[model samples]
Target: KVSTPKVHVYSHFPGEYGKPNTLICYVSSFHPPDISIELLKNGQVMSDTKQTDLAFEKGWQFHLTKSVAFTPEKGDEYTCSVRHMKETKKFSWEPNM
Candidate 1:
C-alpha cells in the first residue's frame, strides 16, 4: 500500500475560457521521490511536460505541469497521472477540459 501525497490539479481560469487559462498539475511534499508524472491531452501523452532528475531529500517536493484546454469534441480529456513504486502506488487526476 502507498501513503497519500499533497497533489494539486488546477488552473488560473476560475472557470473561464480563452486566454491564459492554462491547466497545471503538481505533486509535492511527499516521501520517497521514486514517482512518475504525466500530462495527457485527449488520452494522448503530452511531450511538453517538465521532467527532471529528482534527488531524494529529507523534505522532498516534485512538480509537473502542462497547458491543456477544453476541446472535448476532439476527445480532449486532459489528465495528469502519477505512479510510485515500493508497494506499487498509483494516482491519477482528470481535471476539467
Candidate 2:
C-alpha cells in the first residue's frame, strides 16, 4: 500500500533566496524508512539528497539550508517526498515574490 506523504514547503523570508528555507515532509509510519528533498527546475531534477535519522515520529520534519543563489524562475518547483515500497510522492511550494 502506497500513500502520498504530506509536505510543507515554505520560505521564512520572502524575496530572499540566499536566506534559509525549510522543507518539511510528514509521514505516518516508522518502518523501513527514508526521506529525500528534491529541487526541480522546469520539470528537471536540479538537486536531491537523502536524509537520515528522520526521527519517524507522528510528524517528521527536515530542515535544509538554502544558500545556493539562483534567480526565481517561473515553472520552478521544490519537492520533498518519501521513498518506500517503490513509490514516490512529491510536494512542492513556490515562493511569493
Candidate 3:
C-alpha cells in the first residue's frame, strides 16, 4: 500500500523575551518505509537536523517520524522536503523580518 505523506511546519515561542523560536518540521501518517526528511534554508540544504523516531509501525501507517529544528535568522526561508517512494513534496516556513 502506497500513500502520500503529510508535511507541516510549526514555529513556537514567539515574541521578545520568550523561548527561543525553533522551526519544526513535522512529517507523519504515511505508508511504506521509503521516506526521509530534508531540511533547507534560503534555498540551501541544511545539515544540522533532528528527528523523533525513525521507521516505526503504527497501525496502518509506516511512520518514519522525522523532524528538524534550528534557530532561524531573519529573512531566511526554510523548507521541509519529504521524499517517499520516489515522489517528492516540500513544505516551507519563514520568520518575520
Return the top candidate by TM-score: 3
* TM-score for candidate 1, residues paired by index: 0.58
Q: In model 2, which residue pairs have backbone atoms overlapping below 3 Å?
A: none
TM-score of each: 0.58, 0.47, 0.73
> For candidate 3, lDDT tens digit of each residue in 1-97?
6667877776755522233556677776777756788778787877766776665554665554444546655555778788888877888774454
lDDT of predicted model 1: 0.54
Per-residue alpha-carbon lDDT of candidate 2 for residues 39-59, written as tens digits (9 for 90 to 100): 444556655433434553445
Whole-model lDDT values for every prediction = 0.54, 0.47, 0.67
Rank the models by TM-score, top first.
Answer: 3, 1, 2
Maximum-lDDT candidate: 3
C-alpha lDDT (0 to 100) for residue 73 of candidate 1: 31
- Candidates 1 and 3: which is better by TM-score? 3
Q: Write the per-residue lDDT of candidate 1 for residues 3-93, one digit (tens) a residue.
A: 4556666664554334444566666655555566766765677775555455445544544434454423333456777765544333344
| RMSD from true fold, candidate 3 | 3.1
Evaluate model 3: give its lDDT. Answer: 0.67
Question: Which model is ahead, 1 or 2, in terms of lDDT?
Answer: 1
On a 0 to 100 scale, what is the lDDT of residue 20 in model 3?
Answer: 53
Distance from true location, Cα of 71 in model 2, Å:
3.5
